[PDB]
Design an enzyme around this catalytic site. Structure first.
Site, mmCIF file in Angstrom:
data_model
loop_
_atom_site.group_PDB
_atom_site.id
_atom_site.type_symbol
_atom_site.label_atom_id
_atom_site.label_comp_id
_atom_site.label_asym_id
_atom_site.label_seq_id
_atom_site.Cartn_x
_atom_site.Cartn_y
_atom_site.Cartn_z
ATOM 1 N N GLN D 11 0.826 -1.201 0.000
ATOM 2 C CA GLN D 11 0.000 0.000 0.000
ATOM 3 C C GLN D 11 0.862 1.254 0.000
ATOM 4 O O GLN D 11 0.557 2.226 -0.699
ATOM 5 C CB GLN D 11 -0.936 -0.005 1.206
ATOM 6 C CG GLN D 11 -1.757 1.263 1.343
ATOM 7 C CD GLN D 11 -2.943 1.094 2.266
ATOM 8 O OE1 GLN D 11 -3.056 0.095 2.975
ATOM 9 N NE2 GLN D 11 -3.841 2.071 2.256
ATOM 10 N N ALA D 12 1.942 1.249 0.781
ATOM 11 C CA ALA D 12 2.844 2.395 0.798
ATOM 12 C C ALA D 12 3.446 2.632 -0.580
ATOM 13 O O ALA D 12 3.451 3.761 -1.084
ATOM 14 C CB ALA D 12 3.945 2.176 1.835
ATOM 15 N N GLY D 136 4.730 -3.621 6.951
ATOM 16 C CA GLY D 136 3.616 -4.293 6.320
ATOM 17 C C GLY D 136 3.982 -5.721 5.967
ATOM 18 O O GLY D 136 5.141 -6.124 6.064
ATOM 19 N N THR D 172 1.698 2.815 13.449
ATOM 20 C CA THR D 172 0.375 2.472 12.953
ATOM 21 C C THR D 172 0.120 0.972 12.973
ATOM 22 O O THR D 172 -0.834 0.507 12.342
ATOM 23 C CB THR D 172 0.187 3.011 11.533
ATOM 24 O OG1 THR D 172 1.153 2.414 10.661
ATOM 25 C CG2 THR D 172 0.352 4.526 11.508
ATOM 26 N N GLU D 176 5.396 -4.162 14.064
ATOM 27 C CA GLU D 176 6.485 -3.538 13.318
ATOM 28 C C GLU D 176 7.852 -4.093 13.692
ATOM 29 O O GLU D 176 8.649 -4.359 12.777
ATOM 30 C CB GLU D 176 6.460 -2.016 13.526
ATOM 31 C CG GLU D 176 5.140 -1.341 13.181
ATOM 32 C CD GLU D 176 4.790 -1.439 11.710
ATOM 33 O OE1 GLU D 176 4.688 -2.571 11.193
ATOM 34 O OE2 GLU D 176 4.612 -0.382 11.070
ATOM 35 N N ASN D 199 7.759 8.677 8.722
ATOM 36 C CA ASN D 199 6.583 9.539 8.669
ATOM 37 C C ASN D 199 6.583 10.543 9.814
ATOM 38 O O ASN D 199 6.118 11.677 9.651
ATOM 39 C CB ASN D 199 5.311 8.693 8.696
ATOM 40 C CG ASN D 199 4.945 8.148 7.330
ATOM 41 O OD1 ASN D 199 5.265 8.747 6.303
ATOM 42 N ND2 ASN D 199 4.266 7.008 7.312
ATOM 43 N N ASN D 221 3.349 12.160 0.540
ATOM 44 C CA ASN D 221 3.833 11.448 -0.634
ATOM 45 C C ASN D 221 4.256 12.412 -1.733
ATOM 46 O O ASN D 221 5.150 12.094 -2.527
ATOM 47 C CB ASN D 221 2.758 10.490 -1.143
ATOM 48 C CG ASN D 221 2.467 9.370 -0.163
ATOM 49 O OD1 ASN D 221 3.315 9.009 0.653
ATOM 50 N ND2 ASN D 221 1.265 8.814 -0.240
ATOM 51 N N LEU D 245 22.764 6.789 -12.017
ATOM 52 C CA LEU D 245 22.126 6.012 -10.962
ATOM 53 C C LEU D 245 23.142 5.170 -10.200
ATOM 54 O O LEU D 245 23.088 5.089 -8.967
ATOM 55 C CB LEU D 245 21.039 5.122 -11.562
ATOM 56 C CG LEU D 245 19.938 4.673 -10.605
ATOM 57 C CD1 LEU D 245 19.098 5.865 -10.176
ATOM 58 C CD2 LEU D 245 19.073 3.603 -11.247
ATOM 59 N N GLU D 247 26.148 5.723 -9.570
ATOM 60 C CA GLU D 247 27.157 6.475 -8.835
ATOM 61 C C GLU D 247 26.826 6.583 -7.351
ATOM 62 O O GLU D 247 27.736 6.726 -6.529
ATOM 63 C CB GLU D 247 27.311 7.870 -9.440
ATOM 64 C CG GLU D 247 27.755 7.857 -10.893
ATOM 65 C CD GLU D 247 27.998 9.248 -11.446
ATOM 66 O OE1 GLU D 247 28.008 10.214 -10.652
ATOM 67 O OE2 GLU D 247 28.181 9.377 -12.674
HETATM 68 N N1 GTP Z 1 4.644 7.944 3.387
HETATM 69 C C1 GTP Z 1 3.615 7.106 3.315
HETATM 70 N N2 GTP Z 1 3.573 5.988 4.125
HETATM 71 C C2 GTP Z 1 2.529 5.127 4.061
HETATM 72 C C3 GTP Z 1 1.496 5.376 3.172
HETATM 73 N N3 GTP Z 1 0.596 4.383 3.305
HETATM 74 C C4 GTP Z 1 1.030 3.517 4.246
HETATM 75 N N4 GTP Z 1 2.225 3.963 4.735
HETATM 76 C C5 GTP Z 1 3.039 3.302 5.773
HETATM 77 O O1 GTP Z 1 2.954 1.889 5.690
HETATM 78 C C6 GTP Z 1 3.104 1.341 6.985
HETATM 79 C C7 GTP Z 1 2.492 -0.046 7.136
HETATM 80 O O2 GTP Z 1 2.686 -0.816 5.975
HETATM 81 P P1 GTP Z 1 1.527 -0.818 4.867
HETATM 82 O O3 GTP Z 1 2.033 -0.274 3.555
HETATM 83 O O4 GTP Z 1 0.370 0.000 5.386
HETATM 84 O O5 GTP Z 1 1.067 -2.354 4.738
HETATM 85 P P2 GTP Z 1 1.269 -3.143 3.353
HETATM 86 O O6 GTP Z 1 2.616 -2.815 2.756
HETATM 87 O O7 GTP Z 1 0.147 -2.809 2.397
HETATM 88 O O8 GTP Z 1 1.198 -4.700 3.748
HETATM 89 P P3 GTP Z 1 -0.183 -5.328 4.274
HETATM 90 O O9 GTP Z 1 -0.208 -5.292 5.777
HETATM 91 O O10 GTP Z 1 -0.305 -6.759 3.820
HETATM 92 O O11 GTP Z 1 -1.332 -4.516 3.722
HETATM 93 C C8 GTP Z 1 2.408 2.331 7.894
HETATM 94 O O12 GTP Z 1 3.048 2.375 9.143
HETATM 95 C C9 GTP Z 1 2.530 3.654 7.165
HETATM 96 O O13 GTP Z 1 3.449 4.486 7.833
HETATM 97 C C10 GTP Z 1 1.533 6.496 2.354
HETATM 98 O O14 GTP Z 1 0.621 6.721 1.566
HETATM 99 N N5 GTP Z 1 2.594 7.362 2.430
HETATM 100 MG MG MG Z 2 -2.031 -3.761 2.293
#
Ligand code: GTP
Ligand code: MG
Ligand code: GTP
Ligand code: GDP
Ligand code: GDP
Ligand code: MG
Lengths: 432, 430, 430, 432
Positions: D11-12, D136, D172, D176, D199, D221, D245, D247
């Site tokens: 998702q990130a 994640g 979040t 972690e 963040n 973002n 890249l 370098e």
């Molecule tokens: N900078 C930034 N960080 C994000 C964003 N969305 C999620 N994150 C970070 O992603 C962290 C958790 O990992 P996620 O990306 O939410 O989870 P995932 O990678 O989708 O993996 P899953 O748990 O299976 O869904 C959170 O603590 C957020 O800080 C974003 O849009 N921008």
């Molecule tokens: Mg996810």
């Protein structure tokens, strides 16, 4: 010429500073919006930008949000860089301990960050101008912090300060003796020279000379702007025998502790009253050597002069300046110290004072400001030490300061340090 | 041929320098841009004495302008006549001296002095015969004393043989534009006595007297006093620029006017000095011109020659003048005032005549006098120095900039000996 | 007749190359399209020294442009002056070097080097007398060091007798645009000392100093520093293109300026370097021109000659100049600075005069100096090299591209001996 | 210049990637429909087509259909090739084991198929850009799979990654420590250098500098897009001293394990606030060497720098860059390691940053980005190892991972590997 930074501390400093920067904009013709109309002088006090909007090279600090908020919403809101106006969350409560130990240190580092970022962006830096008040918590406790911090990171650079010394009789607070003496103990070793001014004296002059019965701080601060403008005129405008910022300390500070030259200015005449006056060079010059024209209510005739800086302004014939100064040296009532035969420092700039719109004082073609250092000021210190001794003898207000992380002995050391200052003045008043 | 390189330091030096080149450029008919438009060929014949040359007729005056803060020099550069100087000559600092000798001599002049020599040497090696250096400063200030004395000391080391004359402003007897003038002046004198071949002591107070007393013009102070000074120093160097029946030179005056190495502080004088309105009521003949040179009314030093005795005297006349009158009057002066001249020197007057007069005149003369009455001035400075130093009035500012109070004692002891030496030559022979 | 073939490698080399041909094309009056429009016949008489020819007047400059990524070269091709080069000369790869010497010397330069020789040989056999090769690169980078040293080694094998001069950028003493400059520079020097006949060590930091100090132009860095460099290298090869009273040559300077095979790293200088606004305040005569060549103010190397002693010096003047002044001044320089020249060489100055000046000037001169003060530079690189290598700072990147740490020790040991050799020639005779 | 592939994971990564490709379209003036208005730069990130519609050279993967579905129906639906947007059926549930062992491998081969078909259609290939999150399941478990797979099939090609390193205090999620450490164990040997960002730090800067009280991931973002744009600007736009890249790894990775350069950017100033600033080259340069401007909330002054890459942008005078960098090398507070005297890498491109429509940050004429590598980051790893040890000591969440085909010893190995990383950092911080 090179830049000089202005640091405004406390309600007195912030309120006084706004009066000063109104004059600077008028002298250089800078619009209150910050944009100059459609040159090399303003660089000392104003920083350039890609656009036409120059930024003042000053920093405002106040532990109480109220005072600065007026500036932040006034007609000068667009003049100042938003980060320069530093504001706290709660006032120091007229407490030296709060502004110096507990709450002063919470925001001191933030001010230094803006001083460094502003001090580093100048190839050269003459020094710092500092405006504060002895009779406040922020203006006395927080100031001492900056004087100490500014003494280490930027040691061996000028630190000039205009201060509202407590008035002899009038008083807008009850703990002035405690607070005022404490800062003097700490600021003696971390300052070059302090330009003392008393509101009682300025009020007396305003009713006596300016001929307006109902003045206000908005009016006095404009007068205080003139002394600052004349003092710093040499750094902006061309003129024969220019006087730099670092020259004041050498001429007016014979000894490290004796650095309290009381301010004087001339002429202070109303617009209507000026039409009946000639305003010759000697007239304005002789107007500064009488106890009826002083910004600190002390009688020079009681003591002895030991150093004097004359900063003439406008269309001035230096020959007349030489003649006028010579006459003052040959009057019995005027008395200089024995060991300082050479007791004057002249300075001239070709820029007549400017009149703030709607201002009270007239449009004088010529003006003069004096920064005499006199041992008669020891009377004021003795009086302040007397008032301090009356209270601390019964231990009448220390509980406020002790509870603010302040050791008891600080009051004992503070008075003893001032006691030595009295003796130091006494010895200088005689001849070996 | 006999090139002179000009040095000007401090705020006073540059302003005097600035009006020093506005006069010379007028004599040689040099436009402010550096383009020659004169009428007489003699102007070009010796234009190389002060002005270098660049293709197209651009004449570059080799002055070296040094100050510890850009303030004054920026005014000269923006001046109407500032387009002439070579931009590379301006040597500007960024932290000016606060009138304390130590800063401009130890901590701040030391950092900037090396840059100046890099500019003198270029103007020194560009001259086929370099006669001597010229310096204009003020003793009272910090930059004209600190760095001026520092620079004059350096150029003495590399060019010991070359001449080095100084036109220096001396603190006034009673008025003072600075509080530390005794400290600064006393240290400066202790440092010149060993390095400078000839010094022209002048002071504003005496020069003020000329403005209102013999002239009648009260308005100006610095725009005109410098112009009287500029005319005086121009007269001294005229023989090296124009033909003369009896040509003089910086070395000729030094030998004639300097009996002993430590007695080289003179006091200049200039004539004629008449007001525009009273000028038509006066003759311009030689006799009257010579009378006012020896009166304390027309002496640009605060010291009155009557209280003392002349040791050596030099006159540098100008214009088409009868050399018999130029010589009969001097014999007349010596006999009339026989008590004003020392016996152990049979003759005390040196004469020199230049054919071309100064701009706007047909007759002129610059007086240079070595009188023991000048000892009063140093005596006075010592009285003021000892009073302040007796209680350490301001030593903390000077000690804190890399200095010791032992130097002050040396400066006071050396000064005391200069006063004593001048006093020995008041007695007559045997 | 005495043909030169130009090589440029790396990002720095091409950009310097690019501004190297904009200058020459201006001297010979060659339009960017390759069409001649000059005025003087001498331009054509030796136009074959750099430019080949194609029917219709199209003059093809035989430069060989090589880089490991198309980025920089595409800019040159799209440049206004990119229409002149023969498209077949651009030798471009597809995976540039990441500033690691090994990749541009072992794994990636090896794959591309064979293609370049196929283009040099064609430009080599198209010349009736090929004098020597010319190379422009940077030691700090990977392509200017890796492949540049690889290519210079190859052309040494086939053309051992021919001259091969290098204008090379050297890492700055204190600032650095790359972290691995000691590794890359140290390996490059160990590889040039054995192959290159003469090297012109230059650095941006010193060349920056010229921009603001003697000139007054702060805006540009790379558009103008390259133009100063281009003028310098053009001066060196002028004698092979225009008539001269005392014609010089790449071999003449090598013999005069290279006492020993391993001491061939010079440091150039150029004059006059005046700002447009201050130019009219300066004479353009020979004496002044020669003064600034020997001052560390106008040295395109970071090393100050004062700390060391000159071994050999060469001047290549240009324009209509009096050979007496060209020679009297050099005798003057040697005597004035007798401590700056080694005794065991009786004469250290080589002179050469060309009749035709550079475009936009009537006088010029290129200084080439062999001074032992350059040993400071290698000494400094070794200090940095040993510090990083003492803990294997980045060796893993270099070892992983077909390299061994034993080579680093050899490069450090060979470098140490170069420093030692320069140090032996500080002592005087006997 | 040659192409570079972008791989967005989790998702990130997907959410961050959409912010990036909004900037690229604006820099090259590409319409969101994919059709350029009616040049050689965009070839590195965009693939050509017979029509005027260019295709981004990126791949999006996410085990949860929800995140990508927003892109698939947004205003950028026509920009991406439909097969690039890879979506699974169920989320990884913040589980490293799921995204790495059980469900990650079910879709890993599909992603490689699109990477190969996209990697094979370029004559040259600089490397891969990878965006993911330590905190994640998909962004940590599935990423490790790609790093391993991309290490074999395309070994010896650059693999740069921007990662959302766990924040020091805010969080979040609850697992972690377990998830973040596990990926670091596997990604240490299969990556060049990781551009960590927190963040917490970005939020602090946004409220501290951007002067907006209520930010969101849609806002952060966009800031993260700037660092990517400035980093890759050298591959698209012409400029003196371009930086490729490959370098970065050579300059910023002294040792294979020490490849964590925290990101920094300057200037971050609001549109209104910028009118009161000059934005000189030294000003922006000195703004990156204070702990108040970092994308990872770590204090550089605690540790020591050992490598720094400066990628200047816009109308930049390199002479000023040389002078500004030299000053930073001569400050006692700024401390580089003993064995790296040559600790900088400059890069300049003649293309000022572009402002996204309706964006918060101003239209700066000039900007700079730093990729300093500092041993102060070892503090963050130690803290993360401390949190991990607290949980696994009681064996508080392993049952979720063990049931997902994950051996017990993996946690033991993961911490031991990170333990060695701490010692490796410690040794580099001293001098032999
Ligand atoms: N900078 C930034 N960080 C994000 C964003 N969305 C999620 N994150 C970070 O992603 C962290 C958790 O990992 P996620 O990306 O939410 O989870 P995932 O990678 O989708 O993996 P899953 O748990 O299976 O869904 C959170 O603590 C957020 O800080 C974003 O849009 N921008
Ligand atoms: Mg996810
Ligand atoms: N000349 C002048 N003096 C002022 C002005 N405002 C306040 N003062 C003086 O300041 C003195 C008291 O200190 P303050 O400045 O009011 O208090 P402070 O510095 O804000 O410190 P706090 O008590 O924490 O608020 C009073 O006695 C006034 O004489 C002003 O506008 N002009
Ligand atoms: N004749 C003359 N004297 C001046 C002038 N300006 C300043 N002075 C004298 O110079 C002294 C001040 O020296 P100053 O140059 O300001 O000190 P410094 O530059 O810091 O070394 C004063 O005593 C003045 O009398 C001027 O224009 N003309
Ligand atoms: N004089 C000059 N030097 C340059 C220029 N561009 C890069 N350099 C120098 O070249 C070095 C970088 O080398 P580079 O060509 O990028 O490495 P490579 O191409 O991969 O071998 C830096 O230290 C720069 O100082 C330029 O245009 N002019
Ligand atoms: Mg208050």
């Amino acid at each position: 010429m090179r830049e000089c930074i202005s640091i405004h501390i406390g309600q007195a400093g912030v309120q006084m500073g706004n009066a000063c920067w109104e004059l600077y904009c008028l002298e250089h013709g800078i619009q209150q919006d910050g944009i100059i109309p459609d040159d090399s002088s303003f660089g000392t006090f104003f920083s350039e930008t890609g656009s036409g909007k120059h930024v003042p090279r000053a920093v405002f600090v106040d532990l109480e949000q109220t005072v600065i908020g007026e500036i932040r919403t006034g007609h000068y809101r667009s003049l100042f860089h938003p980060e320069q106006l530093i504001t706290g969350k709660e006032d120091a409560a007229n407490n030296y301990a709060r502004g110096h130990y507990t709450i002063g240190k919470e925001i001191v580092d933030s001010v230094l960050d803006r001083v460094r970022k502003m001090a580093d962006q100048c190839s050269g830096l003459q020094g710092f101008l500092i405006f504060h008040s002895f009779g406040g918590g922020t203006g006395s406790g927080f100031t001492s912090l900056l004087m100490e911090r500014l003494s280490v990171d930027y040691g061996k650079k000028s630190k000039l300060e205009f201060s509202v010394y407590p008035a002899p009789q009038i008083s807008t607070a009850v703990v002035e003796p405690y607070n005022s003496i404490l800062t003097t103990h700490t600021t003696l070793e971390h300052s070059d020279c302090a330009f003392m001014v008393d509101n009682e004296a300025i009020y007396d002059i305003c009713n006596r000379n300016l001929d307006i019965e109902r003045p206000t701080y908005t009016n006095l601060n404009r007068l205080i702007g003139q002394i600052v403008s004349s003092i710093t005129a040499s750094l902006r405008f061309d003129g024969a025998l220019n006087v730099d910022l670092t020259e004041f300390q050498t001429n007016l500070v014979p000894y490290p502790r004796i650095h309290f030259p009381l301010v004087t200015y001339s002429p202070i005449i109303s617009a209507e009253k000026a039409y009946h006056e000639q305003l010759s060079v000697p007239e304005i010059t002789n107007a500064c050597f009488e106890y009826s024209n002083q910004m600190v209510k002390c009688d020079p005739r009681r003591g002895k002069y030991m150093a004097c800086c004359l900063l003439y302004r406008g269309d001035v014939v230096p020959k007349d300046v030489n003649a006028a100064i010579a006459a003052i040296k040959t009057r019995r009532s005027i008395q200089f110290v024995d060991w300082c035969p050479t007791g004057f420092k002249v300075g001239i700039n070709y820029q007549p004072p400017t009149v703030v719109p709607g201002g009270d004082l007239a449009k004088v073609q010529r003006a003069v400001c004096m920064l005499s250092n006199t041992t008669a000021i020891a009377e004021a210190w003795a009086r302040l030490d007397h008032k301090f001794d009356l209270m601390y003898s019964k231990r009448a207000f220390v509980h406020w300061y002790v509870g603010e992380g302040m050791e008891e002995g600080e009051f004992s050391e503070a008075r003893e340090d001032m006691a030595a200052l009295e003796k130091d003045y006494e010895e200088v008043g005689t001849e070996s | 041929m006999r090139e002179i390189v000009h040095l000007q330091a401090g705020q006073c030096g540059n302003q005097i320098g600035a009006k020093f080149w506005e006069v010379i450029s007028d004599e040689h008919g040099i436009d402010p841009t550096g383009t020659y438009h004169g009428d007489s060929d003699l102007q070009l014949e010796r234009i190389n004495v002060y002005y270098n040359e660049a293709t197209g007729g651009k004449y570059v005056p080799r002055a070296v302008l040094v100050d510890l803060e850009p303030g004054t020099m920026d005014s000269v550069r923006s001046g109407p006549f500032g387009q002439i100087f070579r931009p590379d000559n301006f040597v500007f600092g960024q932290s000016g001296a606060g009138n304390n000798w130590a800063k401009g001599h130890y901590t701040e002049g030391a950092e900037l002095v090396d840059s100046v020599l890099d500019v003198v040497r270029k103007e020194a090696e560009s001259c086929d015969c370099l006669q001597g250096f010229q310096l204009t400063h003020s003793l009272g200030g910090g930059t004209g004393s600190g760095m001026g004395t520092l620079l004059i000391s350096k150029i003495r080391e590399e060019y010991p043989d070359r001449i080095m004359n100084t036109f220096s402003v001396v603190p006034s007897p009673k008025v003072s534009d600075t509080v530390v003038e005794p400290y600064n002046a006393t240290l400066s004198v202790h440092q010149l006595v060993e390095n400078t071949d000839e010094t022209y002591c002048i002071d504003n107070e005496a020069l003020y007297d000329i403005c209102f007393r013999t002239l009648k013009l009260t308005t100006p102070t610095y725009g005109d006093l410098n112009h009287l000074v500029s005319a005086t120093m121009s007269g001294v160097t005229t023989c090296l620029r124009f033909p003369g029946q009896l040509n003089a030179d910086l070395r000729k005056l030094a030998v004639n006017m300097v009996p002993f190495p430590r007695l080289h502080f003179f006091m200049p004088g200039f004539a004629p000095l008449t007001s525009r309105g009273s000028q038509q009521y006066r003759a311009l003949t030689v006799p009257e011109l010579t009378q006012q040179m020896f009166d304390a009314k027309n002496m640009m030093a605060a010291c009155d020659p009557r209280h003392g005795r002349y040791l050596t005297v030099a006159a540098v006349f100008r214009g088409r003048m009868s050399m018999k009158e130029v010589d009969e009057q001097m014999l007349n002066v010596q006999n009339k005032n026989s008590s004003y001249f020392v016996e152990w020197i049979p003759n005390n007057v040196k004469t020199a005549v230049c054919d071309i007069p100064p701009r706007g005149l047909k007759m002129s003369a610059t007086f240079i006098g070595n009188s023991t009455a000048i000892q009063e001035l140093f005596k006075r400075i010592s009285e003021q120095f000892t009073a302040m130093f007796r209680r350490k009035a301001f030593l903390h500012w000077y000690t804190g900039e890399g200095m010791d109070e032992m130097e002050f004692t040396e400066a006071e002891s050396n000064m005391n000996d200069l006063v004593s030496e001048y006093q020995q030559y008041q007695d007559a022979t045997a």
